[PDB]
Design a protein around this nucleic acid. Sequence first.
RNA 1: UAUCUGGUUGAUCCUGCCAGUAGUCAUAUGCUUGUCUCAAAGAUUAAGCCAUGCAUGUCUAAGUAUAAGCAAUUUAUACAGUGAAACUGCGAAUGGCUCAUUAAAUCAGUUAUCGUUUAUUUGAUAGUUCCUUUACUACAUGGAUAUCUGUGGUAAUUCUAGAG
RNA 2: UUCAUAAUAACUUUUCGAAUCGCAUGGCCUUGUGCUGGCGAUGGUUCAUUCAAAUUUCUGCCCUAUCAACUUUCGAUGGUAGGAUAGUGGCCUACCAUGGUUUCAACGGGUAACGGGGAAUAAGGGUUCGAUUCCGGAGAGGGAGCCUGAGAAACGGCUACCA
Lengths: 260, 171, 134, 182
Amino acid sequence: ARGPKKHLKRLAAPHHWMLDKLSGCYAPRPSAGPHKLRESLPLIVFLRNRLKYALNGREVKAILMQRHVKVDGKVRTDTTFPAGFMDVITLEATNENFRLVYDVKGRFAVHRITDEEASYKLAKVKKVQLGKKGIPYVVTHDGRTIRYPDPNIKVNDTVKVDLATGTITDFIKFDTGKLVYVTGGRNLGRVGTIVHRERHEGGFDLVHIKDSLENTFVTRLNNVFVIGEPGRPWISLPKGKGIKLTISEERDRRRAQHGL
Amino acid sequence: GFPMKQGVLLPTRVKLLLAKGHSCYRPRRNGERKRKSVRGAIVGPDLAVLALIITKKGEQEIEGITNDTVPKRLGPKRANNIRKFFGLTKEDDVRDYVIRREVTKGDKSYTKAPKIQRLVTPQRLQRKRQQKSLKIKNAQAQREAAAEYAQLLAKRLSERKAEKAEVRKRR
Amino acid sequence: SDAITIRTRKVISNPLLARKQFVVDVLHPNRANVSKDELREKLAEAYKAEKDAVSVFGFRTQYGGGKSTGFGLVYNSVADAKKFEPAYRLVRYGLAEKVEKASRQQRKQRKNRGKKIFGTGKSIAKKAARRNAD
Amino acid sequence: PRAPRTYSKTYSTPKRPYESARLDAELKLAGEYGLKNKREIYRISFQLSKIRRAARDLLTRDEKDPKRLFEGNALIRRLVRIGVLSEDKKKLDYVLALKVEDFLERRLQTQVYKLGLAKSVHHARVLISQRHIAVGKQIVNIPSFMVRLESEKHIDFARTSPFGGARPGRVARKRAAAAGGE
RNA sequence: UAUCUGGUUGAUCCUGCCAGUAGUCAUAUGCUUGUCUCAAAGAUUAAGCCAUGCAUGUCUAAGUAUAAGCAAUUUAUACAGUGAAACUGCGAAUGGCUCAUUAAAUCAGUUAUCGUUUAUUUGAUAGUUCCUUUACUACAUGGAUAUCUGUGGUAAUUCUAGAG
RNA sequence: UUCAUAAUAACUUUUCGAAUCGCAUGGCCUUGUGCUGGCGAUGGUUCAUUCAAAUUUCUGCCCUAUCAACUUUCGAUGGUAGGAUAGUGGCCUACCAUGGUUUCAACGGGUAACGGGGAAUAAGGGUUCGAUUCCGGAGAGGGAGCCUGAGAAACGGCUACCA
Ligand SMILES: [Mg+2]
Ligand SMILES: [Mg+2]
Ligand SMILES: [Mg+2]
Ligand SMILES: [Mg+2]
Ligand SMILES: [Mg+2]
Ligand SMILES: [Mg+2]
Ligand SMILES: [Mg+2]
Ligand SMILES: [Mg+2]
Ligand SMILES: [Mg+2]
Ligand SMILES: [Mg+2]
Ligand SMILES: [Mg+2]
Ligand SMILES: [Mg+2]
Ligand SMILES: [Mg+2]
Ligand SMILES: [Mg+2]
Ligand SMILES: [Mg+2]
Ligand SMILES: [Mg+2]
Ligand SMILES: [Mg+2]
Ligand SMILES: [Mg+2]
Ligand SMILES: [Mg+2]
Ligand SMILES: [Mg+2]
Ligand SMILES: [Mg+2]
Ligand SMILES: [Mg+2]
């Protein structure tokens, strides 16, 4: 295509979007934003589909235009704004806040966060670079170019963003023995207790990660996101804690917790 | 009916490529060149209409050009332009010297006057002050941040020196 | 024994639209489908709201009568309905008239005709009058 | 440009077109079950072939393998819920021997008759097409309906239509109108 | 959904095909034709030709207003309401159609860009424009040009010549 | 890494660093129209981020040997330097060298061949099809040329030839 592409066809949208392959030909393409359109989640899908707050795209545009949704403390009135991973969505109507965390199966499940800890945010550092005039800046997955960080912060780390001003609050250093959260591929949405970091120097560092129930799995570095030290997750996990129970236990707990 | 173009220096009609800036053509789409036919500049017999500007007044009055006068259509709009048009003593509050058009719809007499651009409102000064104050505030904030960062690195460097001294003395 | 039995399910109060949304199930023995406006009245008196500030649609009855399903909303005020509901349902409920529109091909042809001319039509009237005259 | 709505085929025509014994057997099952077209038997044999293929695929692997366990238990649960195979042969291997008659047993007209209401199962078929029978307050004009065991207790007539206490309907009513009038 | 049957000979076994058989999101065609749900559809020969109609235009409280447009009643001395036209900016490079060219070409899986451009979107970011700061508009620098008003040209075209 | 960044020296037919709009119009009283302050909208340098765009490694394409040598005077393979590119690159130019591929099928010819995700078919192994609902690529009669624009060699955009 001679230039950028603007239309996204309904089949091409990622499966985790949970879209209906029926009842429409197209899919809402996320605009340019802080996240990859393969990974993000447009507000249209979040509201019309996940929360069932509005039937039709038009009144979703209406909700957006009245400046009620608040992403990271900002209005973000775009109807297809790509509010990506573990951003915060505030609605002063109902006064309720959510945090976008993948569930155990992988998709963007709704997480009801209370107000006071909805203030801040957690970010994975993607680069640390000395900017112009010798000013060091750190950039995260959100693209939030934070200026003047603590000099001993490095790549692959997690930093606590205020989201009131845009400054660092605290940070956790990446190493072994640390509660981590997985954000890509087969182990999407899992929560782990990293046991090993393994190099293969020159490309695609891997990590061996242990769950809460001693089930180890190995995954690439770029899909890894630290969440706290062992035992105290800095952010409330979604229900299920991403332990990744196998299918037989899904049916066994559905039968055990049976009531209709 | 083919229009003639200035600067052709020819008594004949010629095909020519034209674009914006030139006459004899208007670009519908942005920046599109069109090859169109235009009449040359030398005047012969083959010209149907001559658009002649009369330069100097003549002895014989012509009925419908000179004795009458078409009213000047639209007054100056920019404030400096109005002052220049009226010669208005720059600090003379040109606001009230605009040429009003009182319009009569037939029964109600209403007012209609041009909005003056470039006019020095208190609002413009408000904007200027806003910009200047914000710029200075931001620059000062950045200087403060740089100062704090320098202090932090001095502290950490001292800590690391103390550690290396402890190790050197220990061994 | 008519006894139109209206019941609501899966309702949530959404103040974002200033609304309460729900799915309507209606039990009507020995009777056909149940005339939306009647449902508007019954729901409005049910939630102590005006017959205007309610909007219900999507009534599909199950195969064999008895029960039917639709989808309904109750707005906080009538102005909420005026400002938050697509106008076609306003015409259905009669609050707003059906805006007149010439057939779409008429509009498209007129738009092409407008694109044909550069500027306003005042400049071409007298000029064409003179051209046909002379 | 529109997403494809998938579809499928739901029967399998036999390889041999005119062998006798098979013809007699099909016509038999048609007789005691009142089947309309031979394609019926072909359909049920199609599901049965699907089940045997799945069962063979699962029996291939060792017992207690994860997929074997999960898939087999889900299949036999579906089978007992639909009520074809007994509750005593929950073994994933007895589901090799189905003998297509068994699936036909759970057919709606068949279960109607085996509950009564029918008097020549054929009548039941007609009744099904005459909207007189409901599965627990829900009529079904579908002769097969593949009635499942749990709801079998509630196959009865409808509140609407005759045989279920409603308006007589369109023939006795007009006869009564003609008798009253003349 | 691991299957075969008829034909060489007077007869028998074989190699062998031919024929029979069953599908086909493979079409064509014939004969028929009641209902529900769903739905392919000028690809094969012609990436052959096309009349006609439509298929990309867009303005918010917030870029430009004296439409000699409406509004003019209750907000109205610089205008302020609404809102043609036109200027400005943005998109028109997406979508849709087709499969002619193409045989390590396209493409698929997997890499790299420490080798590059990237409007937009989102984060950040700029004191110095002084140039000898004791003669400079910063309480705001200049001129145009559309729309429009008017005289027109061609047989006709989204043709536009001149003046204000 | 000659990377980021910094610093010194100079250079520039000196790029940018807000002469722009809406709402609200608070506080100080230096009581003047005086000094000042908000929520916004647009622009605006650089670097990030995103949407991409290009090129790119390896491996994988049907039939044909009644196609076995093919490519280099006109670029074929490599070197140096330059030009041109947004940038590597014979991409192109000048001067050199004689190399490059091939019976592990190159080169050539055919394809009623767009490639692929797939469809039909079914003990297992396979055979055939894939114009087309998704992904890429190519084209807008055929070829070439180009302005605008971040993005086109655009075609419901132009220029020229041919039909
Ligand atoms: Mg396209
Ligand atoms: Mg013989
Ligand atoms: Mg014989
Ligand atoms: Mg044959
Ligand atoms: Mg009917
Ligand atoms: Mg064709
Ligand atoms: Mg207005
Ligand atoms: Mg424009
Ligand atoms: Mg073809
Ligand atoms: Mg072809
Ligand atoms: Mg070839
Ligand atoms: Mg450098
Ligand atoms: Mg070089
Ligand atoms: Mg092919
Ligand atoms: Mg194909
Ligand atoms: Mg395509
Ligand atoms: Mg093209
Ligand atoms: Mg054609
Ligand atoms: Mg643009
Ligand atoms: Mg072209
Ligand atoms: Mg096009
Ligand atoms: Mg054009």
